[PDB]
Amino acid sequence: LGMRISALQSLSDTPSPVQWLPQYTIDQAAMDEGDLMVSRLTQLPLRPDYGNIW
Amino acid sequence: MGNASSIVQTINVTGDGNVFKPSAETSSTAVPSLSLSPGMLN
Amino acid sequence: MGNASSIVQTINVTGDGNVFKPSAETSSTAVPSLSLSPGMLN
Amino acid sequence: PGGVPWIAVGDETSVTSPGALRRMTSKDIPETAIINTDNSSGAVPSESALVPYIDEPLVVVTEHAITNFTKAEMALEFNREFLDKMRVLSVSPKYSDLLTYVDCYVGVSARQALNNFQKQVPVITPTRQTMYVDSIQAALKALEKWEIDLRVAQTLLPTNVPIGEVSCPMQSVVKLLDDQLPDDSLIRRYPKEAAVALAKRNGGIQWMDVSEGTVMNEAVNAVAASALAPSASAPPLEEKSKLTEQAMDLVTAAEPEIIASLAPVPAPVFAIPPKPADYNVRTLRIDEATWLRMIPKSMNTPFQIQVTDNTGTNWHLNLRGGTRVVNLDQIAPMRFVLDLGGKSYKETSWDPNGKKVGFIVFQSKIPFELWTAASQIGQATVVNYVQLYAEDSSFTAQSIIATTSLAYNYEPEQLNKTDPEMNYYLLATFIDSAAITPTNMTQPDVWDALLTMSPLSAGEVTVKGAVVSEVVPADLIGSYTPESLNASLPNDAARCMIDRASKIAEAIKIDDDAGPDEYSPNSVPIQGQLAISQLETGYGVRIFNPKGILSKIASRAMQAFIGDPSTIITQAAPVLSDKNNWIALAQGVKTSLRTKSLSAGVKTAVSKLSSSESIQNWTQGFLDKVSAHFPAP
Amino acid sequence: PGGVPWIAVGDETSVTSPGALRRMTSKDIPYIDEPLVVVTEHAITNFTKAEMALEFNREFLDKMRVLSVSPKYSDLLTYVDCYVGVSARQALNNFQKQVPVITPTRQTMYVDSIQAALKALEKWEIDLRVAQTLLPTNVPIGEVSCPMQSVVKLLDDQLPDDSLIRRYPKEAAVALAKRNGGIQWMDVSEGTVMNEAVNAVAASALAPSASAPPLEEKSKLTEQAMDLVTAAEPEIIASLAPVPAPVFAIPPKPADYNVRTLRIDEATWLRMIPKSMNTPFQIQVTDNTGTNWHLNLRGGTRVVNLDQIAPMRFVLDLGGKSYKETSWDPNGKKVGFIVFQSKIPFELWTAASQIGQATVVNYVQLYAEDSSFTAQSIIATTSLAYNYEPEQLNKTDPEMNYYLLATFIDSAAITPTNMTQPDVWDALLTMSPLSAGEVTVKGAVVSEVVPADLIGSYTPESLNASLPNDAARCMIDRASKIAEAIKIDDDAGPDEYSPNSVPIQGQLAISQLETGYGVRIFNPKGILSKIASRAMQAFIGDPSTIITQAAPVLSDKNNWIALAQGVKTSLRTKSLSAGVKTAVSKLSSSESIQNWTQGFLDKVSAHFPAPKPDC
Amino acid sequence: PGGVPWIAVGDETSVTSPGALRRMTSKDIPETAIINTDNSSGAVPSESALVPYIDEPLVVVTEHAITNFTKAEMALEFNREFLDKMRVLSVSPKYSDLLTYVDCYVGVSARQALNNFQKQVPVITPTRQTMYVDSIQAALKALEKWEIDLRVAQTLLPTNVPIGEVSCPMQSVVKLLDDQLPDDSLIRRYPKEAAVALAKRNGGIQWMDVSEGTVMNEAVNAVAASALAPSASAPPLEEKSKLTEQAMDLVTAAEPEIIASLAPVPAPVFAIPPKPADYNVRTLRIDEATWLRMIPKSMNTPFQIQVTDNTGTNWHLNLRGGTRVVNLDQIAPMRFVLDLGGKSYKETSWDPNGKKVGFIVFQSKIPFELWTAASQIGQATVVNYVQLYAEDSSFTAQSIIATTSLAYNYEPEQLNKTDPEMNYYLLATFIDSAAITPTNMTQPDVWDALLTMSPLSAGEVTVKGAVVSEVVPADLIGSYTPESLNASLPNDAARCMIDRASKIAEAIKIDDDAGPDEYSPNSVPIQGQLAISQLETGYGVRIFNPKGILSKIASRAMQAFIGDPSTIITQAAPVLSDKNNWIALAQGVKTSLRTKSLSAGVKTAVSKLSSSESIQNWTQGFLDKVSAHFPAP
């Protein structure tokens, strides 16, 4: 088995969602398949809250 | 490209809607050379 | 095809009946070269 | 497919990770071992104490290797008769009987091999492959003298005609071949074997059968002959293919894109192995050679200095008006060789015979022009020196100096270069252990001698006498007057560009066959540019020319390029000085060559056919001579 | 197969039918539609090899988290039954089942993925090459050994400080083991070690046997020799019939002459006024810009004739000459070219009425310096340039005569008694052709040339005074390639018969047996063998001997034709062979190099000592 | 499989069974005869009196041949429309329709065939092969003018771009072509067919069907163009592959085992075709030139001798102190040319006009320097001579000899070398028909001119002026000085080493782009050798240097070798005078060039991409200019 030997570090659960900065590799794909997969995985339609613009 | 004459039954040389879009990927090739060495044919 | 004298032979080198007809379509060839590059052989 | 075979680690046909695959060996396939070899060649020992029993790996053999080794064995089969005569290799190797066919995983690494399962792949061990190669190689080794003698027999008289057919009675050929063939040859010892081998190689030679009577073609290489044969209207196919491929290789080597760039290109990528150059430093003009310096003339106070080499020996020498030196900064590494042979340097007050000439290097912060009274000399040492000799000269009452090869290497890395103010100079002149009186010796220097410079680097490029880090190849076009070209350094960019373009010129000449004032696919790129440029608006009087005049001018441009490939550099060239024409031609050469479809030129084809017919006529005349001077019974 | 796939539009089909075929597209497989292209076998095999070229470095590619999944070209190919061909007629005549097809988009994406991986692996590749090259890892023949710990110590010692092996040693070890089967790593868990290389066929192709050179070297040398001879074009240079100039010519080279030192009879491209005229005269010529220049003509003046010369460029250099007289001083003076065109021949010229239309095409200023000799001054280097392009002149009228002169010019009239030098032709001239499709013989343009008559006709002086575009230089440069190929293909020593020298021997024997005028003589076969050997050796050592007059054997025509044909008929009939002496010398040299490598490895082991045995 | 097909004759069969096989002929297979072929092309006559019946052999076509001849058919299928117009070859040839499938023993010889038995072997008869190839050649001959015109149409304006994409209105392109097209072009006569062929060859040109109004790519060579195009960040794949192949072929061209052997190598195996050399005897020294002899200058008593030529006309000569000769023995056959241009030889009582200068050969036992009296000359002959002629020169009151070319061919075989006590000497001097008064002429000879030496045998080799039967290349390294090099014979071993190493220099250049003082794959072996050697025991003061300094030293040494190859044979050269370093470099070059995997330098990649962008911009600008004029209506 190719694995590092180390035990997990326990953490408590974050009560709100966290930011995430993505980083790109050199892999590539066609745009159409990306739109198709986004259509499959999406949770729309939905009614959100608006907030105040001013 | 052909010149000094126009024929539109099938392909209009001088008509609208034709594309001239050279590219590195499309390139242009024919059959320049082959493998006709005496030892490989037999 | 050098000279040789024998009583009875299956083919006679110095005999009469042979054909020496050099032609461009027949030509002469052997195995002088082959493709043995390191990349292509693997 | 290639690589190595892989097997499961014992899992129940459920391989879902590259960790469950291990590389196959000869224990997993027992038929690939060394003891299971058929040993038809007798190579493997039969004694059980001598055959090893160890685990070897397996590799996959690809179809290219199979076919090429299979043809390698037929190379040996061309000489089966003589090989039988020496009792060598009585059974053909038959490569296909060494491989083992297995359904396995194929690949180089486990991750790739896992997702690729193949059926009926051929594998082999390294040992058996080496044995097979050795068997063929030994069989080839045993035939050197026989093949040489066979080739001598074939080439003694012409057995091939370029076109058509010729004839001669075979008895005359046999008589001539007996008369002329060497005694050492094995043909005399083994005639029938040579006859059968020649009948196999050449379809012309046909041997009548005494028992039955049928005489028939028996060569085994007719397809290759038809590939080489010329039709009665066109040249052979293979020759056309070979010529076009060679032209494409030259264009590829010339790097058509490097020599047409409009943006800076680094020096090491632009350079090529250079060549030495020769000069006469005294005869050069200082405003043309930017790499020389000279003390102001009409100065009327000569001065003397002293200097010591690396052994501490002191030397005296004198500087006067007219003395010249060479800047040794910003010229890259370079090797100098100086040769004074053929010059006199003879006066009534000084004779050169027995004197010594040396290279002296100066370091100072003061320009060489503003030097006098030896206080401005700065740090200086003698590098090298040599002693002269005098001989009689063709001119009556004069004598000349024998040859010398005074050498010096300049490597910029060693010298400190700490202060940009500092200046380096080099000079060649007389030196002597006694002070040279100014009245006796009046010559400013000994720079009146042949000077060869050879670069000491391949990643350094200068322009007009100063090194640069990058060049723009499209900015060298039409920017050199002839006077600036005989005074540049051997590591100049102009020489690199000229040598690169010479390959394009050679390729165009190889591919194209056009007479004076005839359009060619390699000369219209200039024509289109000329038309579009003459339509545009700049400044000055416009002139409009028809298509015929433009075609003629473009053809003349291409011819002037091919004949002399340095016109692109030359300033004020008629048409080739413009950078657009150069770029268009260089780019269009590739497209012109890549789209040929097994073709040639009309003039080439017609001349080639006429030449070949003349050759057959001469061959037939020679064969008539042979059949007439060696009568058949 | 190749080209594209097609589909029948109708039920009615035949070998030659109007219509009946349309091209297949992505709609016809089971919106954007793209065409399909049939993929050959060559592409499949070569692209698979390219993929495995990446797969050598899987451990590194997995440490760096790139290229998780392999390309696998054989997924992208779709198998279908259809008419295949480049055109509709070929498709109508053909029909195949299970041909593979692909669209251009997918092919471009595939090649881009491979190129991206190759761009990411570059520094790693250079680093492994450095590691392999630092110490000798290959030997021409045999087998040498060295302890591994010492080798790793040396590598740790001398590898660069930014080398990527120092960051990934285990991956570099596995990569080197894959490339080279000599470097083997023991498996610790089981204590077993064996060869783990994936390249064992090319290794056998490149390996010498016990007594013979490698196969690849022999095949490569033979192919190179055939390519050289094929480029030489034996048929053209053996022709006994006229061949056009554009076919025969090959790119020319410059030539250097001295005009004054040449003799008139050998060189026919020069005209000199007779020395018996005994009187000078002076003329005034206007250049292109209206400037007036006065120059003087006298006896002995030489001019180059421009009539039968191809477009040519002249560059003249005066460096080293003195041209200093009692009443003239070269410093500050001017020298230039003048182009005359007149209906009166040069030798008849006596007055200014005969000079015709003249023009000072180019001119320079002369600068003088002290020379080596005492109280002597010499001129600095000049490059006077002229381009004779005939088509810019009026060549329609035949009576016109053209001449070229180079001499002193001045704005004031030159006094005849001050200067008695005729011209400045006593200087180094460089001529270079401008047309690569026109050839001259002996100093006159020829429409076509006969290659079988140039051989054995030039005396040394005539060959000297040739122009750069002479047919003899084309012949020399076209025979030099044959000479080089023969030298590559042969190792015969002094007086050793070779398959490349015997055609001359056969020709000599036949010629000897014939009847002709003269005192008849006879020779054995040994004498003819020696004579042929000397002739071939002299040819190889000097390709310019076929054209030189009164040559021993190569001045003849039949010998040349026989040799040219013999080259081809000998090269074409080899079987992967080599000379005996070449083979034995290669074996001995390879063994010596092996011994040197082993000694160096012993030195490497002596320093960087390995740990002593533990117990 | 390759070879010919065989059929059984005797029932018995074994891998060596005698006389069990016989050639299979068309009499067995009726489908092969020319009376049973399909005339879809129209070659075999339909009249029964014009189709012969003679039994014909059979050969086997290899899969290589099938693929390449089908490619040849594709080479014609591009131009189908114009072939249709000319009514040539209406039905396209199909090669597989000429092959007969049979199963039998296949092999080159009977012994190989006895072990081989395949099924579905395809066989052909020679005449069918010739007929097929003739049809292809006739189709190619028909298309010459058309192919040239189509290439001109493609090349007239930029149709290809190195990278990226361009665009232009096709109406403007058509108008420009109409304006610049040649008058005789078939493109104007047949426009539509040219358009269709262009659409086949290129993918940028696209045409719409006016019936349905659709436009799409119709090129048929996408697969190859994918390999020809440059992807992002990397040059085209084929260019890299081809450059690596060319470098490896350069390395193989000069065998590294020959140039780095430590053991004697025969002269013919080492030799290469040489080049001429030019010398001047008076300027040469006796000490350095080992092939010269001189009478000691102390003689001062010249003597006059007479010698006859081959015809029988006597001549007169004068010898004195200083007269120089060339020692012929111990040198291969040679060719000498003497050129006396630009010399005066004018004395108070001697006028060079009309005087005769010639070569003489002396054969004598007495050594040259002991020569005092006439009778000691032995035997002499005037081989060749030329008359002189003087013209006025640039110097005032001076004259110069015109250009002369005197030739001599020294062939030892034409002499007898059996008597060891025999000396052969060569002289060039004045000759007369009467006595030459020594008071009149004071010159020793005419050897103060130009002398061209050209070898006449490329199988012999000299070192320092003496012939050697075998040479050791490793010992030549670092053993020559410029004084000993410029005075070498044309066929020296030094020049052979230089020319065989120049190929290695070029090969190293092709694959490197490193700058000053940078480590490379080719510069490390010298560093390793230096690092090992500095630790070895010696005699001097030991020096320790770190890793970086050694890497710099190796880089500089390799660069100096590339810039001037002859430095490997120069005395006291910095790093390349140690033969270990030379052997290490020569051996490591092959390993460096064999492990490359379709790669290039980082500098070359970035420069190639930048240049491709620059030409892309240039082409777009030109097409904008073209569209501004010739506008689309």
Residue numbers in the entry:
A (entry chain J): 377 to 430
B (entry chain D), C (entry chain A): 1 to 42
D (entry chain B), F (entry chain F): 43 to 675
E (entry chain H): 43 to 72, 95 to 679
Q: What text does the study give?
A:
MRV is a prototypical member of the Reoviridae family of segmented double-stranded RNA (dsRNA) viruses, which is further divided into two subfamilies based on the presence or absence of turrets on the inner capsids: turreted (Spinareovirinae, including MRV) and nonturreted (Sedoreovirinae, including bluetongue virus (BTV) and the life-threatening rotavirus). MRV capsids are composed of two concentric protein layers, encapsulating 10 dsRNA segments. The outer layer of MRV consists of the protection protein σ3, membrane penetration protein μ1, and spike protein σ1. The inner layer consists of proteins λ1, σ2, and turret protein λ223.
Meanwhile, the outer shell particle, consisting of the outer layer proteins μ1, σ3, and λ2, appears to be a byproduct of MRV assembly. The outer shell particle appears to be a byproduct of assembly, as it lacks any inner layer proteins or RNA genome. This notion is supported by our single-particle analyses of viral isolates (described below), which show a much higher percentage of outer shell particles in the late infection stage as compared to the early infection stage. Analysis of total particle abundance from the two-time points shows that the proportion of single-layered particles decreases between the 6 and 48 h post-infection points (4.1% vs 1.3%), while the proportion of outer shell particles increases dramatically during that time (0.5% vs 22.5%).
